[PDB]
Write a protein that binds this ligand. Structure first.
Ligand SMILES: [Zn+2]
Length: 73
């Protein structure tokens, strides 16, 4: 550990995409998502979609978002 040449390796990009949530009001990065609600919700809130009615959670089903090409083999 020692002071060397001025910091060169810099990979800092702009930060606009960042959107302010409406439910909680946290700062997050809006990413590709299937338009469902007409409001800026952060990943955190999104999870609380309030859909899971039954106490159960998952009995052998891994919810996967649309991906390039179907799933076959
Ligand atoms: Zn939120």
């Amino acid at each position: 550990g020692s002071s060397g040449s001025s910091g060169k390796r810099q990979k800092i990009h702009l930060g606009d995409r960042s959107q302010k949530c409406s439910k909680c009001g946290i700062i997050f990065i809006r990413r590709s998502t299937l338009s469902r609600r007409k409001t800026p919700m952060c990943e955190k809130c999104r999870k609380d979609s309030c859909q899971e009615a039954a106490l159960n959670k998952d009995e052998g089903n891994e919810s996967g978002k649309k991906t390039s090409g179907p799933s076959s083999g």
